[PDB]
Amino acid sequence: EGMWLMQQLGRKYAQMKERGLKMKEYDLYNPNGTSLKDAVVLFDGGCTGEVVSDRGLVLTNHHCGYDMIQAHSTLEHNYLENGFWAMREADELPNKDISVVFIDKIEDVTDYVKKELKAIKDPNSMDYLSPKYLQKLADKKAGKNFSAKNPGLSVEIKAFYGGNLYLMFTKKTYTDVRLVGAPPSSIGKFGADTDNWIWPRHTGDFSIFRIYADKNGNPAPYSEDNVPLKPKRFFNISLGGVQENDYAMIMGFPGTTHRYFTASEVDEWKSIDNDIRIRMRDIRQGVMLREMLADPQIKIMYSAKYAASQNAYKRAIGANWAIKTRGLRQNKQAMQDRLIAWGAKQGTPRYEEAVHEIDATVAKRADLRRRYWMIEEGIIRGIEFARSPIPTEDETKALQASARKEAIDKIRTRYSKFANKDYSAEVDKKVAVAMLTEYLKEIPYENLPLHLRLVKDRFAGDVQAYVDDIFARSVFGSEAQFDAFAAVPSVEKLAEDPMVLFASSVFDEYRKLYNELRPYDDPILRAQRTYIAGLLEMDGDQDQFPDANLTLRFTYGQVKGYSPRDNVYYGHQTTLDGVMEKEDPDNWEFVVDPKLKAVYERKDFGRYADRSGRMPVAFCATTHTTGGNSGSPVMNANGELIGLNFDRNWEGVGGDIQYLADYQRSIIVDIRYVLLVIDKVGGCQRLLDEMNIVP
Amino acid sequence: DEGMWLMQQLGRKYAQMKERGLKMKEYDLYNPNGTSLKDAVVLFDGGCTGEVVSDRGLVLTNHHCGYDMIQAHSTLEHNYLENGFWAMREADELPNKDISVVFIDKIEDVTDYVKKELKAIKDPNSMDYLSPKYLQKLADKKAGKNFSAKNPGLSVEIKAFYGGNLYLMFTKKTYTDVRLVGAPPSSIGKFGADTDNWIWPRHTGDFSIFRIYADKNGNPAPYSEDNVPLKPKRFFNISLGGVQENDYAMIMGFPGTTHRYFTASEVDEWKSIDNDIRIRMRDIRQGVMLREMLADPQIKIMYSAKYAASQNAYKRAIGANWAIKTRGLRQNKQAMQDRLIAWGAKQGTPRYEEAVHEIDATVAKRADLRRRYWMIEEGIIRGIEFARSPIPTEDETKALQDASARKEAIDKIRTRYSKFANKDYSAEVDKKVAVAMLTEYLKEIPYENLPLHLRLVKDRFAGDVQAYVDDIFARSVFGSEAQFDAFAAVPSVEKLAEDPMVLFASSVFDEYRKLYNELRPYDDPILRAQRTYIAGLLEMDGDQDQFPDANLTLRFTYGQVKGYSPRDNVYYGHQTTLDGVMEKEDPDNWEFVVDPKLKAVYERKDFGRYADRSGRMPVAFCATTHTTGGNSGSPVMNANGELIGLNFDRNWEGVGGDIQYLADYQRSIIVDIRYVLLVIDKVGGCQRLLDEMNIVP
């Protein structure tokens, strides 16, 4: 059910043992010694990884190591589509701007922070959640020359439970992390966008890296002299596999949850956030689809933009399904009413006052938040020419010395980035007409961004004429129109340019709304501190976990499927057969790698097939995971690696507000399939040899 | 494999059925010399199955079977199609014009009689052995001269079975006064509508109620106000015990057609010509229609039914090609024919090998012709609406070239033009579809094989298909209403003789008929060889584990109530519930709108005796019975022969079941009788229908 703090392992150990856990508590997490926790890393700031060998080998998702594989890919060696398999440690590719963070120590500093907070004076100061204030407190407790006296280490204090608990983290950061192996994109992204958020799933979502360090194993930036890290702890790979109901656990860095939302916040998330995103993205995607099907060149140009738009669109559909069918609003309402009833018995009205404060703030920011979401979904991300070039104050005070040619070159570079190989003005005009028509229907004249008032005032309500006029008269409407400006550039022309005026006024309103809405976050956060304090004082810190905040958490459950709808059951495990069933040679998402197809046909599964002779691919578990858990190690009852978490089913996106026992499942790639791809697809035997594999 | 058995075969199948769960006596299910459950089964309206469920002639069939009858009695004031219909008295039951119910009174094996009559062989290559005309003359001879007059209500019919190796005579009793009694709203009767068509799980309450009327003596009589309900020989008892997983289930009904005895070459031909051309051509047509329907809501209204109709045989061809590819249908037919050829060699009789070779050589020889026929039929005949534009008749042409009969010809042509360019026809949409269909057609059919008018694409329009289609509408009398009226005012035969749309329609129909006439001769050697082939298969494996092809005659099938795994890690159970209806509810989608009375019954858990032990309300179930089109409305029976549901569909994974039964995929989709009774009771409030049925606890 939860995303538990490492501090809570003691309090949860008995339940985990009853659910199947066999390893000793301190072998999983030891607050003052070495444990399995020491083999978990925060990979590249937003993913999880795990050390799987005594030479610093690291496994994470394919989508986690994707940018690294893409950076080293060229026309000659396209590692993204064919995979990459360094046959020696010297061949492993270094990555610029990469990091791996070990959580060396975790300490409860609640009383220390609460005492330091007493010197604030302003009762509504947000310093209790300020990373700047909390870093000054972390530096004070660690020492003045802490990072110099402890090379590789750094400290950090994070707030938990809306400011009711504080933990200090001692982090060891390594920045020389090299690409070691990666399956082809056909395996690493098999489902691609169709199977995104979907169970059953047949994706071999993994990539291999290695941590490098100085001769003493201390963190060091990339140097040819760097040597593999001999870590204090690494995971053993289990070949025993999984069976239905088997205990499974995960350690990783879940990014964010909203477990303590009020019922009013759930209504707001549905009726504003999700409904606007769903409505606006449906209009945008509809026009893009019409155009992509009509012109194969437009399909090439807009495929990635269409897929990107579909991602949060699908998540919003899934979230609204949970609000409607799983009774999320009602359960939050029950939670707050239960607290208010208890507070009345205790003679303490501050909890009821706190829920009322959140409710009144949500009610007050409703029209503002609606306008912000309307402009963000409708214009900022909905219309490409909203992100067209806007001349800087320096550029205009250069056009009106001969640094006029420098200004035109700077504007030309931004214009080339906007009107690139993937940009179509005709498609953008069509999308803009449909998005603006919907926007003007929902946003009244008095609340419109200044330039959009011209639709009524100058164009007699003709949206198509207004959009046509923007491209016809603008210096960014076509290459010829830009070059004509570039030859005779006058500041007067830029000041009255219809596309510049549009982009400027839509961004003015977007920032104006953001600045008006920002003040409303603080009374809610302050009230949430009282609200969560009451919930914890009433039900205890045993059956309720703190919201995810990109810190190390553990979760446990069982390998199990679920019934998505009446008369349908989705089992706990997918197989290689399922990959072959989904094969479509004329669909880039479902193309099957020839070496993998041959392995399947020849039944060349070695020691990686299950007892029935079927090759496993992925499995699902009742663990509680969210974004940030990508690449998280999945463990056995004995703490051996059984797979890597890579997704969560769409029926479980609402799990960020309320865990859904009968629907929510973590989508994990079976470690047996990972080793099968390394062995029979990459032929990288040296990686299997350095891992500690248990039969 | 699992059959559609003749009633004659019940005796030799009875032991297996008993072992599989059957508890009733053989002659209580079918008796050649007495009353049996067979007497409660009817052929409803010529292409559906029905069943008598009361001693006053009450009949249950599907909602899609009684659909046209419900639509005919519906008006703006009383829309029975939308809200349902529930006659609260027998006098309120609505009569239907052109309706029928056929009872199979007797079935008799007349093989030796037909085979003896056939020996008066003028030509050994005569197809009289399969001729309905010749077989009706033989049926009349055996029954007697003036049998229909001497036996009011009865008629006789002889059908060929096993490619001409078995013949049965059927004595049919036809009733033509069949009145609408009850029907659920379309929201229940067609819940899935087109989305859930061929789909399991399924949550559709596909049923409608009718009543057979007859004269005072129970004899067939056309509609008369004096007609009285029929007191049937036998009727089904309704079981409320329900179904559980693995329970024995059986069905009686009229499966229309199968091709169980196709050679491997016939399976290749069906895939590579029939299905591949239908899939390719319908995909192009449907693609253009979709683009236009989404762009203009008026075009969506006009083309919705045409789009859905095209999608029907398209989905079937996709499903059929899936089975050929994944279920090894070609290989299993090849194994069947090789097994026979090996046995024939051991017996010293080469006629079976010679017969398979004959089929194979004929299929090979007609390949280019059949490809061209399918290309023009899918591509132009069905694909382009202006191919079915008016063609002036021989008499119409002659009339316009010295009497008032000139105005009669223009009125006849105008009526056909109005039928073509109707409220649902869009010339602009038709031009766009034609350009895409013709471009694909011209790519596959070489110049020398093109219909004469299509040669102008290369010769006159420099390959510009769009210009050729534009020219047809610009210069044709049928290109617009104004263009027709201008012709109608000053009509000359010269104008019609050189009309580009008339020349197109004539030219495409001339090639369509020329190909049909060239292909027709090839059917006969295959049919004649199939008689030898099936005769060999029967002589070798016996008439025990192989059934004859479906031919719209009464058959029985049995299996178990069971689900299946459609794909890796997915299982579809044996039973759907009312909960599944509620999960699928979409108030803004006409297909998934839930009836308010039904939603409240669900909310109030007002399920009476119709719920299962767990208190859940069942809706539909699936079984391993072997059914095909024609089995719609078929009664589904218990181990004791009590009605447990009505068959209404088959899953798409089982469309290949018409060539080879697919044990692990093919399932009959049946509406649970408890849900039927729930809708009658709590939605229709028609208690009198429940009272007249014999319901077992």
Ligand SMILES: COc1cccc(CN2CCC(C(N)=O)CC2)c1
């Ligand atoms: C196939 O359709 C459905 C839908 C819902 C429930 C079931 C029955 N369950 C299947 C497997 C499950 C398990 N835990 O293994 C227990 C019972 C089947």
Ligand SMILES: COc1cccc(CN2CCC(C(N)=O)CC2)c1
């Ligand atoms: C969704 O998970 C799958 C997929 C395919 C097969 C199975 C195995 N079980 C199916 C159902 C059967 C029963 N209930 O009769 C028992 C065996 C499970």
Ligand SMILES: [Cl-]
């Ligand atoms: Cl370490």
Ligand SMILES: [Cl-]
């Ligand atoms: Cl012979």
Ligand SMILES: [Cl-]
């Ligand atoms: Cl099968």
